[PDB]
Amino acid sequence: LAHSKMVPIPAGVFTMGTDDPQIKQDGEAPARRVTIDAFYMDAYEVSNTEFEKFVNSTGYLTEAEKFGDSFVFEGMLAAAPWWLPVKGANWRHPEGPDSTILHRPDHPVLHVSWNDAVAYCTWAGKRLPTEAEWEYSCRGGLHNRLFPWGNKLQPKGQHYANIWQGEFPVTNTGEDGFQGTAPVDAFPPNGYGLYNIVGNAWEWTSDWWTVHHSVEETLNPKGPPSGKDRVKKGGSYMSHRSYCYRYRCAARSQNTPDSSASNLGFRCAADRLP
């Protein structure tokens, strides 16, 4: 296992966002041309095992452990009735105190806040990606497509990401092989070598959230200089066409930096190899 391996993301120019926004309130539009310098991206979401190495090394207590609770999705025991703040839910106990990660060491780490993620990435000699870096990487060298692999959800009749099948939130059929999270190396890689960049766990980025974007061309943009929420990308194992259609590279959402939940993780990036 090499679940902390990084891949080189080539220098290039790409179209960020879309002029055919599917969720207009999220500022998916306008499409804008963004130039990104070559850098490195984690191939995988950070796994439980990799996060445990960090905690073993530093003694780091995550914000959810300090707060004493975190949000858990009801269907596997708030912003929605299916989200409960569960006392004692955290990265080691993803559904609460009588859950464990012992049988899922290679699944993405969850209940990690933006601050937790920055701590991990920095410890590792890395950083969070910007939203623009994240999206460029997600798109995997294709232009103006819905998904890392193209415009069809199940190309060649194959599942390409871990999202929801069935009627959300009552019934997840597990058609794609995973009801909850999958191992960080599950499903095909995209054109750049990235796994689970859409679906599985949501992923934190470094940017403050705004929905107001210029059409101006930019170089290595960092997002707005201030805000209250940080940007997350990519959707999760819970995502579905009918409710949270955000397993698209252009999609975007946000949370306050001290937030944590059972569907939210991260991956790191770096300017050079650590």
Binding site: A79, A80, W83, S113, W202, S236, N255, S259, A261, N263
Partner: peptide, 6 residues
């Protein structure tokens, strides 16, 4: 809404 904030 996909993840509630704390």
């Amino acid at each position: 809404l996909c993840t509630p904030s704390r």
